[PDB]
Symmetry: C3
Subunit: 103 residues, 3 copies
């Protein structure tokens, strides 16, 4: 089993959270245009996921911690149900993050 | 005191500048959609700041140097007046940059 | 001659390709909003190029490999004809990539 299907160093960062309900670690994150806060990636756009949640959230925190770089194992991330496969594969394209098979 | 409230290596890069007036070092930068040039981050959108000015500018340079990665100390950056706090904290979300308390 | 006009480590990543015709290595890439697939950077927007093709493509592959970080030599990249100079220089602004003269 794995999480970091890569050698390129994984770094973390903090940011204002806009998540209200409980969300588990390893959930892709995106920015909420209206508020500028981080929330779960909705899977609507490739390149929109700008981070991966490090630790799980209750849904009441004002801040959160996420991975801003690194190569992750696709199978370890909590993807939104029914997400488009192409947008999934290119979810982090543009950031320092990326993902692939374990193997 | 500090500037690099982080261990993740800070790297720099160059790019076409669209700044006309004098601007001090450590000023967040954003891209100008109309021209594709780099200018001061206006604070209107989280994730829009794509770099931090390394050296100060006169306002007549055609090119500029900025940090494209690293973890900076929030207090060292010249933020735009009255910027929204959430958009401030997530200013660089999406890039290789990030910031936090000194501390 | 060179390719990596920089010391900051070059890392790669994979993603769904939307390229149909043959394209050579070192071609800037961008995301296709409609599909979420990666295609050649059209040069219309600075900060839109999110990667550089590692190996050449036939135009029938469903996946591709690209550099997601590093500092490249401008002269080694296959730029789109007549691209605007400012959008060229700031092509990767926002990602972990960047480019400059060899020297």
């Amino acid at each position: 089993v794995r999480i970091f299907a890569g050698n390129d160093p994984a770094h973390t960062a903090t940011g204002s959270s806009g998540i209200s309900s409980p969300t588990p670690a390893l959930t892709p994150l995106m920015l909420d245009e209206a508020t500028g806060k981080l929330v779960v990636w909705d899977g609507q756009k490739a390149g929109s996921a700008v981070g991966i949640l490090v630790l799980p959230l209750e849904g009441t925190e004002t801040a959160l911690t996420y991975y801003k770089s690194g190569t992750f194992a696709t199978e370890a991330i909590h993807w939104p149900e029914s997400v488009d496969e192409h947008k999934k594969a290119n979810a982090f394209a543009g950031s320092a993050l990326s993902h692939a098979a374990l193997p």
